Amino acid sequence: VFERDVPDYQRLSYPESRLKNGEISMREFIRQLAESDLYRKQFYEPYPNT
Amino acid sequence: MQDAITSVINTYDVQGKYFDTSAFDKLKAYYATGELRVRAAGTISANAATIIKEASAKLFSNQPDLVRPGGNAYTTRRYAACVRDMDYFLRYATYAMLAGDTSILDERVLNGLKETYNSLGVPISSTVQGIQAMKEVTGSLVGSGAAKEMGVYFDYLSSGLS
Amino acid sequence: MQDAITSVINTYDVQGKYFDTSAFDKLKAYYATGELRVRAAGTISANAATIIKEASAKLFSNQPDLVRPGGNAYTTRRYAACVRDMDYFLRYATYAMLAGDTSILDERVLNGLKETYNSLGVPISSTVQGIQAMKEVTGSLVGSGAAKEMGVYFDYLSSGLS
Amino acid sequence: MQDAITSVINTYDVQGKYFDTSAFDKLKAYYATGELRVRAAGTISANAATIIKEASAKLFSNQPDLVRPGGNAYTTRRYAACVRDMDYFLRYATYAMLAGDTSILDERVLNGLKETYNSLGVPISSTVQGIQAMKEVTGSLVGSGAAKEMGVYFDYLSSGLS
Amino acid sequence: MQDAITSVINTYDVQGKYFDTSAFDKLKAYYATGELRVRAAGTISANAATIIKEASAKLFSNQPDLVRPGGNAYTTRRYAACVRDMDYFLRYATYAMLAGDTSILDERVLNGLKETYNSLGVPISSTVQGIQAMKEVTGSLVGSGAAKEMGVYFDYLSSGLS
Amino acid sequence: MQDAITSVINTYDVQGKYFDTSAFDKLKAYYATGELRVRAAGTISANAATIIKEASAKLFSNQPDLVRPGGNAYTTRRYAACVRDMDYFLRYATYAMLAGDTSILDERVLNGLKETYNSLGVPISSTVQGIQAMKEVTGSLVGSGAAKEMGVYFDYLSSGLS
Amino acid sequence: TRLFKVTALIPSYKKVRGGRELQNTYFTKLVEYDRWFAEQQRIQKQGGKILSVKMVAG
Amino acid sequence: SVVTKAIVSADAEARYLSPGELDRIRGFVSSGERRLRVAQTLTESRERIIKQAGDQLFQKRPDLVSPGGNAYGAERTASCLRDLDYYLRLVTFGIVAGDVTPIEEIGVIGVKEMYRNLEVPLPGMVEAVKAMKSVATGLLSGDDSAEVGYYFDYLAGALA
Amino acid sequence: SVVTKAIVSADAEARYLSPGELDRIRGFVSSGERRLRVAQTLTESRERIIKQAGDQLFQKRPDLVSPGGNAYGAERTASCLRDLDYYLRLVTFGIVAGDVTPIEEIGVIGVKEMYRNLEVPLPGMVEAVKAMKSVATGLLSGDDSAEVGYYFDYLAGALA
Amino acid sequence: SVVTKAIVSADAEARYLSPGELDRIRGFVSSGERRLRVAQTLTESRERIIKQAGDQLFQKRPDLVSPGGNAYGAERTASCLRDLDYYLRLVTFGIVAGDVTPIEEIGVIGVKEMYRNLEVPLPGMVEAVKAMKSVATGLLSGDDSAEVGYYFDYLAGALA
Amino acid sequence: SVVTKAIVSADAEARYLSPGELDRIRGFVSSGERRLRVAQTLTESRERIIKQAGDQLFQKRPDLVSPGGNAYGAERTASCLRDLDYYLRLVTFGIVAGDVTPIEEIGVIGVKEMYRNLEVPLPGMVEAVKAMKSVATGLLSGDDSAEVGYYFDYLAGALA
Ligand SMILES: CCC1=C(C)/C(=C/C2=NC(=C\c3[nH]c(/C=C4\NC(=O)[C@H](C)[C@H]4CC)c(C)c3CCC(=O)O)/C(CCC(=O)O)=C2C)NC1=O
Ligand SMILES: CCC1=C(C)/C(=C/C2=NC(=C\c3[nH]c(/C=C4\NC(=O)[C@H](C)[C@H]4CC)c(C)c3CCC(=O)O)/C(CCC(=O)O)=C2C)NC1=O
Ligand SMILES: CCC1=C(C)/C(=C/C2=NC(=C\c3[nH]c(/C=C4\NC(=O)[C@H](C)[C@H]4CC)c(C)c3CCC(=O)O)/C(CCC(=O)O)=C2C)NC1=O
Ligand SMILES: CCC1=C(C)/C(=C/C2=NC(=C\c3[nH]c(/C=C4\NC(=O)[C@H](C)[C@H]4CC)c(C)c3CCC(=O)O)/C(CCC(=O)O)=C2C)NC1=O
Ligand SMILES: CCC1=C(C)/C(=C/C2=NC(=C\c3[nH]c(/C=C4\NC(=O)[C@H](C)[C@H]4CC)c(C)c3CCC(=O)O)/C(CCC(=O)O)=C2C)NC1=O
Ligand SMILES: CCC1=C(C)/C(=C/C2=NC(=C\c3[nH]c(/C=C4\NC(=O)[C@H](C)[C@H]4CC)c(C)c3CCC(=O)O)/C(CCC(=O)O)=C2C)NC1=O
Ligand SMILES: CCC1=C(C)/C(=C/C2=NC(=C\c3[nH]c(/C=C4\NC(=O)[C@H](C)[C@H]4CC)c(C)c3CCC(=O)O)/C(CCC(=O)O)=C2C)NC1=O
Ligand SMILES: CCC1=C(C)/C(=C/C2=NC(=C\c3[nH]c(/C=C4\NC(=O)[C@H](C)[C@H]4CC)c(C)c3CCC(=O)O)/C(CCC(=O)O)=C2C)NC1=O
Ligand SMILES: CCC1=C(C)/C(=C/C2=NC(=C\c3[nH]c(/C=C4\NC(=O)[C@H](C)[C@H]4CC)c(C)c3CCC(=O)O)/C(CCC(=O)O)=C2C)NC1=O
């Protein structure tokens, strides 16, 4: 989702705990990663909508 | 994106300098304009629909063939795409005015837009005319002081497309 | 996409005109051949596997280097991709014949196909020869009256690729 | 989540009434403690890593078998998960203190937590010990009034576990 | 989902037998009712928004507490959820009428709706009243022959939701 | 999943103990059987199709009603799903036989399988008998030594379904 | 409102999947309130049957 | 179109057309002459349909041409009747195509946004479309009126 | 069926059926009598169809009944003919349905895997289906013969 | 509220509130008394606001209370005034909250569909919100008038 | 800055800035003169702050300056003081921007990788930052002292 390794200080710990607990699936993990501020910062803010 | 403060910080960081008297002057100027910018932003948000209403009305009055059969704004889909584009232009010009900088218009709007319209067949000159109409409508609502500053960013978009 | 009906409709829509005598003549012309089109489409649908087998056999006989070691169809993977592509051409030619229009061939087959095959390394001339073999095999099954209409779209594919 | 203001709003919205004198009294009570809450939150944010270090050090000092082989916090993975959980408790207690309401604790922390720890084998008693350790370290750091407010949400977490 | 035709097919396929005269008679019955089912579906679709208008107006006239502060339909959000649920019930009931079978109501409406409503606290009695209101409003438009058939699926929805 | 070696490692890590004579004997035993396990896995993988065919034929000869109409394996789709489940069981039994552990059978096979079959309508007893048929067919090929080991995991799957 | 916890079974009807696909067939998951209508519609249109709905939070 | 929609459906599944799709194309091309006659009938009397439907619309909804209404004035009323002429032409296109795909492409995608941007009430649009439906099915036999009303009802539902 | 496919397409867009889909259902139900006549004719003559088709298949492919063949022996030949009967019944089912759907759920999805597990040569299946097509088409009238041949052609293409 | 937005934003990134967010909360809680007295003065005079706003709305757009209008009659006019009362209450909630989230969850999300099912025209609502803005800003100090006017502007923009 | 965060938050949701965000921007620009006073104060005492902080650092950790240390020599101790100058400049940038974005993106993201690559002890960085915090806050007024302390506290937490 982020096109390269993300350092530990930027990884989202709450989704990861949710995922290894089985509360959410990989699809919901990917959704959490997409909806984070890191994604908006890297792949929405510097680009046009198209 | 960069706003005015970010731009000053950048121009002083790339040369390793602390802020000078000129930097603090620019920062005071932006903070002084802040209240006017906020008032204009609130007014435009309250009246975004109306601004698009009248801007599109007068653009299609000056260029009737756009909405008539054979024009690029002739079908409900293409007309809706056109007013959606005008919505983009108004919202991002308001962002740029509130920021005091034109960088958001560069990155989020103008980057590749001529390519997009060329591939779509959208007439760019008529889009510039729509932006000019939007300028005319917005300047009435925001008042002269805010009209000058907001017309700065409308003219930035018009110059970037033309 | 477009068919004969949709083509006539878009022609009259871009002028903002109601249907005229010539329009109704064209619509009748399509309705008259719709029965033959359905019959031929069912014929190809029934015999598509046989058509692909015989056309691929003819093509790989005429150009044995295509499937000898170092050929572009030499691996089970690339041979499968080759016969799969021939099946795609047959299916889309049947769609075009049923629609009475070559627009679907442009928009859904031919657009960006030369660039794709050039980046892959697929020999375009051999692909055209495969399409011609498909034409020859299909013509015998469908029957001459349907074969002419089918050959229109087969030759359209060959010319667009050539 | 909801805060004190939002809770009063929801009460009066379900009741359908405008704000009364009692609602304004509650809002004044919450607004009066805003600077205290903000000071406590800032002090905790500055000192969060410290607080976690002393709290976990005391917890593992009293229950040393938790991090020796056979205990629940024995591995680097398990120890890291323990300190991560303690940091969660501190951060969400701070959120609740700022909001003046315990709803975020239920919605985002406690719902499912007890059976999660019960299925994993995480001891509830030791977790409560760690939460009280964080409570007393934080209370030493934040002063008397801020500690009195903070203990409410620490106790809420503890009692929501059991 | 299965319609009447697929219902007969499944009944005769599980037994492993070819069609009998009984199966042919059921199929003839469905083909006989098909034309009136299509007319009823068209009439309902032409009037769907109007039916939801009147049915929700009746449901809130008989129970004004539903849309007042404290009611399950009190907000713009919950009112919209209510009317959207009514609209989905109408469209799926029309599907089941046109198919001659209640299987689509089981598969795509009542599949999980009872549990969702129970968890949310949606008044089951009031939902049944709303469905009854739709039944009444639709019966006026479709006519007695079509209304008797539409009542089957409205009653099925009310029974499953009860 | 978990290996026999990983099993000993965990049993000694939770004790915080180095390997002793007992652990070294267990590791020696697994290392000694490793070559036999690899031979059996190779033979099974080579003959997986033949085992599935013989076992499915034996199962559907003992229970012909399963593939006649009204049986749970009456359709090409349900018959395919049946043989697919048998392939699952064989492949995972081979994984577990190679691992010398039944952990993978719990984690990736039986976890929610009984309830899934219950909701689907699958006869658990007949699936168990198909597993038994795989047991005998596989034991015929792999040989006397590997048959008992492989039947250990077949019996594990049979009991986990039971 | 807030989260639902939904348990559903989605059978396969268009083909037979060579992958294990058990985790794609019977599963329990937490859905946000604002997503549950669309998720329930998707489960229904895939031919899946919803075992149970609960309201965890809220 | 019928053939267009069948081809698109078969393409999404990467397959040739099924016997059912071929059968419905067969039925559509069997019905071509009747559809063309209906379209000619609606075309030859387009001015009468538009004028009569405008009269019924402005009688039932006089607020539109009242002061403050969107149809108020000569030019706004002319543009109103021009919109009605548009939708009649799209109905004829739909009749010849055998489906509502042309009507979707030309006058259903984005109608709510467009008429919002035009201060055009959508209930008024629905009432005008119903007026055209009545006037147009009046000039037709029952078998033709059923399908023509079906297209007009599609328009009304899309605008509603 | 035709009705089920139309409903599923319309529900994929959360919409009521279009005029085209309604016309499709109307044309389907107007044809139910002819379809039931065809299904009746195929059901009454099922045993002649199966016997003559099996005879044709074994005449053209003696290897299937020779020693070492998949259909060698009385029991295997009986299972072969029973499969042919299955597919004839499925063809009748699809005929009354108006589409190849019931054929698809009952006898096409996973068919290649099942005949793979049973050592049944799929070319033998295709040729047996072609034999059934010829026999059945020899019985019906030409107009119905083409429609029935379409379902047999779908089956033979699915087995290939 | 401002507090809820700050906490939610910090929680999304799994972090404590930054000095900027704490500054925002400081500025919000430092203005709590002013917002409280503004909400007090709107609440104590709600009857005057609703009456004068209804008068202005029906004067600017009489078609609503003209026959055939959506608000024709004392019952529908009372429902209109009750809706305006709702929105004044939500504006007071938004004033005390420091943001427009109570207004959003209670009376903006779903307002389009609700008012379409009521046949209420959205331009009428927007003009009624302007009338309420004028009446309410009439009886507050200049800064207080600006503060209430911002929320009324948001409500008008959301209604359109 | 604060304005940039408000704008990106609005833009990610395709909306104009809400009254709360505009109120936040209003409060930010109404505090600008105070922020510039504080930043100019920190700029005047650049050299005092850096030299005092270096003294406090080097008395607490003599081994860093002692032979074999990370900062031993005029060049490496000058690099140390240069890093302190970097971070004080960043603090002034954050003061004017009203938030810690300039600090986080010029000096926090990747700082651990930087100082692992440079073999600089991170506790040394942390307590050098605490030394700068003490020295700088000794110079500011108590109100300004708290504000500057927030940014220094954030930086100290960020290094750890
Ligand atoms: C922000 C809301 C939130 C909370 C509260 C939360 C707690 C939480 N802790 C977990 C595991 C754990 N939690 C602990 C902590 C325990 N070890 C004991 O010694 C201590 C007494 C005690 C902590 C003080 C441990 C060791 C595990 C790992 C268990 C395992 O890996 O099997 C898990 C399961 C998945 C994982 O490893 O992360 C959750 C969900 N997660 C969340 O997203
Ligand atoms: C946020 C920055 C941004 C912009 C501005 C943008 C423009 C944009 N305009 C588009 C289409 C369009 N745009 C227009 C507008 C033109 N037609 C008339 O001639 C007018 C003169 C003129 C508008 C004033 C039209 C008619 C289309 C439809 C084109 C087509 O479908 O062929 C599309 C293709 C997607 C769609 O159809 O909605 C984009 C991406 N994209 C972006 O990411
Ligand atoms: C290395 C990857 C690769 C393979 C394997 C491959 C095989 C291959 N075998 C072919 C023909 C053939 N292959 C066979 C083999 C069959 N005869 C009996 O049935 C046996 C069961 C079976 C062999 C044991 C036969 C008889 C033909 C001739 C087909 C014909 O003349 O119609 C062809 C068609 C073109 C040609 O004949 O040159 C290919 C491409 N191609 C590849 O790129
Ligand atoms: C099997 C996985 C595992 C590991 C490795 C582990 C390490 C570990 N070391 C600890 C303490 C410690 N560990 C060290 C070791 C450090 N001192 C020097 O700096 C050296 C560089 C370095 C060792 C070479 C020291 C000095 C302490 C005492 C800290 C204290 O007293 O506060 C603790 C705290 C609780 C306790 O002392 O029992 C743990 C959990 N725990 C685990 O579950
Ligand atoms: C708290 C948020 C909330 C709102 C806003 C809300 C509005 C609302 N207004 C209603 C009625 C109504 N509302 C109006 C108001 C309109 N009349 C004119 O056109 C004006 C432009 C406009 C008012 C300014 C009218 C006329 C009715 C009566 C409709 C009827 O009975 O046909 C109804 C139906 C229940 C009833 O009959 O009283 C609702 C749900 N409900 C809510 O839960
Ligand atoms: C296509 C089949 C299907 C349906 C119909 C369906 C309905 C449905 N209604 C819901 C909520 C709701 N449903 C209603 C409607 C009811 N409450 C009112 O009082 C009325 C008496 C009554 C309607 C006549 C309301 C008010 C809510 C909001 C409940 C809440 O927010 O707490 C929800 C929760 C999620 C959401 O609204 O986004 C669903 C899934 N779901 C489905 O998969
Ligand atoms: C890797 C571990 C694993 C297993 C074991 C597994 C079993 C499994 N079997 C299924 C269906 C099925 N399974 C069977 C097989 C049974 N019915 C017959 O009568 C026999 C008695 C018996 C086999 C010997 C059948 C017939 C179905 C079709 C059920 C239906 O869709 O109607 C399904 C539903 C999805 C699908 O249809 O493909 C699953 C998940 N899935 C897994 O991921
Ligand atoms: C082919 C698809 C298509 C359609 C349908 C279409 C409609 C359309 N109608 C317009 C104006 C208009 N349309 C109407 C019609 C309304 N008057 C009353 O309110 C009625 C409720 C309603 C008609 C029954 C009116 C009054 C105007 C004038 C708006 C103005 O001048 O402010 C405009 C703006 C440009 C112009 O004046 O020509 C368009 C684009 N355009 C298209 O490309
Ligand atoms: C309605 C869906 C359906 C179908 C179609 C179906 C086919 C089917 N045919 C079978 C047997 C068989 N089927 C055949 C047929 C072959 N013999 C020749 O090779 C020919 C090419 C060909 C027939 C024309 C044969 C020979 C067997 C016996 C194979 C054996 O048991 O060893 C079996 C194994 C169980 C049994 O003996 O009944 C199935 C499942 N099952 C279904 O549930």
Helices (H) and strands (E) in chain F, counts: 8, 0
Q: Are J23 and D27 in contact (CB under 8 A)?
A: no
Q: Is F148 exposed, middle or buried (0-12, 13-18, 19+ CB in 10 A)?
A: exposed
What does the alpha-carbon distance between residue E119 and residue H67 come to, in Å, rounded to a whole number? 51
Q: Are D89 and D155 in contact (CB under 8 A)?
A: no
Determine the Cα angle at I119 with ends I113 and I120, to 5°. 80
What does the alpha-carbon distance between residue E52 and residue E60 come to, in Å, rounded to a whole number? 12
What does the alpha-carbon distance between residue F153 and residue F132 come to, in Å, rounded to a whole number? 11
Q: Is F139 exposed, middle or buried (0-12, 13-18, 19+ CB in 10 A)?
A: middle
| Dihedral sign, Cα of residue J8, residue J13, residue J17, residue J23 | negative
What does the alpha-carbon distance between residue F156 and residue F153 come to, in Å, rounded to a whole number? 5
**Helix or strand holding residue F55 (H, E):** helix F48-62
- Give me F76's structure tokens: 């090409």
Using CA atoms, how far residue B118 sits from B153, C145, J93, in Å, is 23, 43, 49
SS3 call for I105? helix
Q: Within the 1-58 window of chain G, which residues sit less than 8 Å (CB to CB) from chain F?
A: 9, 11-13, 16-18, 20, 22, 25-26, 49, 51
What does the alpha-carbon distance between residue I94 and residue I92 come to, in Å, rounded to a whole number? 5
Q: How far is the CA of C83 from the centre of ligand 3 (A)?
A: 14
- Give the DSSP per-residue string, C8-26: HHHHHHHTT----HHHHHH
**Helix or strand holding residue J147 (H, E):** helix J142-159
**Helix or strand holding residue G26 (H, E):** strand G26-31
What does the alpha-carbon distance between residue D67 and residue G48 come to, in Å, rounded to a whole number? 46
Q: If you compute the radius of gyration of chain E from its CA atoms, what whole number of angstroms results? A: 18
What does the alpha-carbon distance between residue A14 and residue D91 come to, in Å, rounded to a whole number? 12
The single-letter code of the amino acid at I3 is: V
Give Dmax over CA atoms of chain A in angstroms: 37
Using CA atoms, how far residue C11 sits from C29, F42, H86, H97, in Å, is 16, 67, 15, 14
Q: How far is CA B86 from the centre of its chain?
A: 9
Q: Are J98 and J109 in contact (CB under 8 A)?
A: no
- Length of chain H in terms of residues written: 160
Ligand 8 proximity of H132 Cβ (cutoff 6 Å): no
Q: Are B145 and B36 in contact (CB under 8 A)?
A: yes
What does the alpha-carbon distance between residue I3 and residue E35 come to, in Å, rounded to a whole number? 12
Give Dmax over CA atoms of chain J in angstroms: 59
Burial K15-28 (b: 16+ CB within 10 A, else e): ebbbbbbbbbbbbb
What does the alpha-carbon distance between residue C126 and residue C120 come to, in Å, rounded to a whole number? 14
In terms of Cα–Cα distance, which of C24, C46, C26, C43 is closest to C35? C43
Q: Is E84 exposed, middle or buried (0-12, 13-18, 19+ CB in 10 A)?
A: middle
Q: Are E139 and E40 in contact (CB under 8 A)?
A: no
Compute the nearest-CA separation of H151 from chain I (Å).
6
The single-letter code of the amino acid at H16 is: Y
Using CA atoms, how far residue E54 sits from C2, E125, E157, in Å, is 41, 19, 19
- Give me F117's structure tokens: 């079959």
Write the DSSP symbol of residue B65.
G
Compute the nearest-CA separation of G49 from chain E (Å).
6
Alpha helices by DSSP H, chain H: 2-12, 19-30, 32-44, 46-60, 74-97, 101-107, 111-117, 122-138, 142-159
Q: Are I132 and I52 in contact (CB under 8 A)?
A: no
- Give me H26's structure tokens: 């067969």
- Give me C152's structure tokens: 């229109």
* Residue K95: partners with Cβ closer than 8 Å, 6 or more residues away: K35, K38, K39, K42, K147, K148, K151
Q: Are D162 and D115 in contact (CB under 8 A)?
A: no
Ligand 6 proximity of G41 Cβ (cutoff 6 Å): yes
What does the alpha-carbon distance between residue E72 and residue E78 come to, in Å, rounded to a whole number? 7
Contacts of B108 in chain A (CB under 8 A): 45, 47-49
Contacts of H21 in chain C (CB under 8 A): none
Q: How far is CA A50 from the centre of its chain?
A: 21
Ligand 1 proximity of D158 Cβ (cutoff 6 Å): no
Contacts of A7 in chain K (CB under 8 A): 110, 113
What does the alpha-carbon distance between residue I152 and residue I92 come to, in Å, rounded to a whole number? 10
What does the alpha-carbon distance between residue H142 and residue H2 come to, in Å, rounded to a whole number? 23
Q: Are D6 and D108 in contact (CB under 8 A)?
A: no
CB atoms within 10 A of CB F104: 18
What does the alpha-carbon distance between residue C142 and residue C150 come to, in Å, rounded to a whole number? 8
Q: HEC profile for B96-145?
A: HHHHCCCHHHHHHHHCCHHHHHHHHCCCHHHHHHHHHHHHHHHHHHHCHH
Residue matched to tokens 């007969």: E8
Question: G50: which strand partners?
Answer: G8
In terms of Cα–Cα distance, which of E62, E49, E138, E55 is closest to E97? E138
Direct distance between the N- and C-terminal alpha carbons of chain C, in angstroms, rounded to an integer: 23
In this complex, is the C-beta atom of I156 within 8 Å of any C-beta atom belonging to chain C? yes
* Residue H131: partners with Cβ closer than 8 Å, 6 or more residues away: H52, H53, H54, H56, H57, H60
SS3 call for J92? helix
**Helix or strand holding residue F54 (H, E):** helix F48-62
In terms of CA atoms, which chain I residue is nearest residue C42? I150
Give Dmax over CA atoms of chain G in angstroms: 40
Q: Are H4 and C6 in contact (CB under 8 A)?
A: yes
Q: Are C55 and C133 in contact (CB under 8 A)?
A: yes
Contacts of B107 in chain A (CB under 8 A): 45-48
Q: Are J150 and K19 in contact (CB under 8 A)?
A: yes
Q: Are K71 and K78 in contact (CB under 8 A)?
A: no
Q: Are F51 and F134 in contact (CB under 8 A)?
A: yes
Q: Are B100 and B39 in contact (CB under 8 A)?
A: no
In this complex, is the C-beta atom of D16 within 8 Å of any C-beta atom belonging to chain F? no
Direct distance between the N- and C-terminal alpha carbons of chain J, in angstroms, rounded to an integer: 23
Write the DSSP symbol of residue G29.
E
Subunit contact F68:E16, Cβ cutoff 8 A: yes
Contacts of F53 in chain I (CB under 8 A): 117-119
For residue G5, which phi and psi values (nearest 5 degrees)? Answer: -115, 115
SS3 call for H109? coil
In terms of Cα–Cα distance, which of B52, B108, B112, B61 is closest to B82? B52
Direct distance between the N- and C-terminal alpha carbons of chain A, in angstroms, rounded to an integer: 18
- Give the DSSP per-residue string, K1-33: -HHHHHHHHHHHTT-PPPHHHHHHHHHHHHTHH
What does the alpha-carbon distance between residue I128 and residue F26 come to, in Å, rounded to a whole number? 60
Compute the nearest-CA separation of K145 from chain A (Å).
29
* Residue G12: partners with Cβ closer than 8 Å, 6 or more residues away: F81, G21, G25
- Give me C108's structure tokens: 């859904």
Ligand 8 proximity of H81 Cβ (cutoff 6 Å): no
Q: How far is the CA of J83 from the centre of ligand 5 (A)?
A: 6
Q: Are D137 and D28 in contact (CB under 8 A)?
A: no
For residue G31, which phi and psi values (nearest 5 degrees)? Answer: -115, 140
Using CA atoms, how far residue E144 sits from E90, E138, J119, in Å, is 18, 10, 29
Q: Are C127 and C161 in contact (CB under 8 A)?
A: yes
In this complex, is the C-beta atom of B65 within 8 Å of any C-beta atom belonging to chain C? no
Q: Is C120 exposed, middle or buried (0-12, 13-18, 19+ CB in 10 A)?
A: exposed
Subunit contact G55:E112, Cβ cutoff 8 A: no
Closest residue to atom 16 of ligand 8, CA basis: H80
What does the alpha-carbon distance between residue F92 and residue F88 come to, in Å, rounded to a whole number? 6
- Give me K19's structure tokens: 């009254």
What does the alpha-carbon distance between residue F64 and residue F79 come to, in Å, rounded to a whole number? 12
In terms of Cα–Cα distance, which of E35, E39, E31, E157 is closest to E106? E157
Q: How far is the CA of I84 from the centre of ligand 9 (A)?
A: 9
What does the alpha-carbon distance between residue B106 and residue C136 come to, in Å, rounded to a whole number? 56
Chains I and D touch (3+ CB pairs under 8 A): no
What does the alpha-carbon distance between residue J122 and residue J108 come to, in Å, rounded to a whole number? 12
Q: Could you tell me where the beta strands, DSSP code E, fall in I36-154?
A: none
In this complex, is the C-beta atom of D112 within 8 Å of any C-beta atom belonging to chain A? yes
Subunit contact I110:G16, Cβ cutoff 8 A: yes
Q: How many CA atoms within 13 Å lie on the side-chain side of B67?
A: 22
In this complex, is the C-beta atom of J78 within 8 Å of any C-beta atom belonging to chain E? no
Residue matched to tokens 């800064």: J143
Q: How far is the CA of H160 from the centre of ligand 2 (A)?
A: 26
Q: Which of K2, K11, K29 to mutate to test the interface with B (most CBs of B within 10 A)?
A: K29
In terms of Cα–Cα distance, which of E161, E124, E138 is closest to E46? E138
Q: How far is the CA of D74 from the centre of ligand 2 (A)?
A: 60
Q: Within the 61-120 window of chain H, which residues sit less than 8 Å (CB to CB) from chain I?
A: 94, 98-100
What does the alpha-carbon distance between residue D95 and residue D80 come to, in Å, rounded to a whole number? 22
Residue matched to tokens 């008024």: H124
Q: Which ligand is nearest to the CA of I131?
A: 9
In terms of Cα–Cα distance, which of I75, J93, B131, B154 is closest to D10? J93
**Helix or strand holding residue J38 (H, E):** helix J32-44
CB-based contacts of K24-28 (< 8 A; 24+ apart in sequence): K24/J2, K24/J24, K24/J27, K25/B34, K25/B38, K25/B98, K26/B34, K26/B35, K26/B38, K27/J23, K27/J24, K27/J27, K28/B34, K28/J23, K28/K1, K28/K2, K28/K3, K28/K98
Ligand 2 proximity of A49 Cβ (cutoff 6 Å): yes
Q: Is F141 exposed, middle or buried (0-12, 13-18, 19+ CB in 10 A)?
A: middle
- Length of chain E in terms of residues written: 162
The single-letter code of the amino acid at D45 is: S
* Residue F10: partners with Cβ closer than 8 Å, 6 or more residues away: F2
Ligand 2 proximity of B100 Cβ (cutoff 6 Å): no
For residue F19, which phi and psi values (nearest 5 degrees)? Answer: -65, 140
In terms of Cα–Cα distance, which of J16, A11, J21, J1 is closest to D93? J16
Chains K and G touch (3+ CB pairs under 8 A): no
Q: Are D2 and D101 in contact (CB under 8 A)?
A: yes
Q: Are F12 and F23 in contact (CB under 8 A)?
A: yes
Using CA atoms, how far residue I122 sits from I64, I80, I113, I128, K146, in Å, is 12, 12, 10, 10, 83
Of G13, G16, G45, the CB nearest to I113: G16
Write the DSSP symbol of residue I141.
-
Pocket test for ligand 7, best of F53, F75, F120 (most atoms within 8 A of CB): F120
Q: Which of B2, B9, B36 to mutate to test the interface with K (most CBs of K within 10 A)?
A: B9
Q: Which ligand is nearest to the CA of D161?
A: 1
Q: Is A8 exposed, middle or buried (0-12, 13-18, 19+ CB in 10 A)?
A: exposed
What does the alpha-carbon distance between residue F127 and residue F134 come to, in Å, rounded to a whole number? 11
In terms of Cα–Cα distance, which of I32, I38, I16 is closest to E42? I16
Q: Which residues line ligand 7 (CB under 6 A)?
A: F 66, 72-73, 78, 81-82, 85-86, 88, 109, 113, 116, 120, 122-123, 126-127, 130; G 11-12, 16-17, 20-22, 25
Q: Could you tell me where the beta strands, DSSP code E, fall in chain D?
A: none
**Helix or strand holding residue F43 (H, E):** helix F21-46
Q: Are J45 and J157 in contact (CB under 8 A)?
A: no
Using CA atoms, how far residue J74 sits from H43, J81, K101, in Å, is 47, 10, 57
Q: How far is CA E54 from the centre of its chain?
A: 16
User: CA dihedral in degrees (C34, C40, C41, C42; nearest 10)?
Assistant: 110
Q: Are F153 and F105 in contact (CB under 8 A)?
A: yes
What does the alpha-carbon distance between residue F113 and residue F117 come to, in Å, rounded to a whole number? 6
Alpha helices by DSSP H, D17-75: 21-32, 34-62
Q: Are D23 and D8 in contact (CB under 8 A)?
A: yes
Subunit contact H110:B79, Cβ cutoff 8 A: yes
In terms of Cα–Cα distance, which of D34, D99, K146 is closest to J26? D34
In this complex, is the C-beta atom of H123 within 8 Å of any C-beta atom belonging to chain E? no
Using CA atoms, how far residue B116 sits from A43, B157, C107, K12, in Å, is 19, 15, 19, 21
Q: Are H3 and C3 in contact (CB under 8 A)?
A: yes
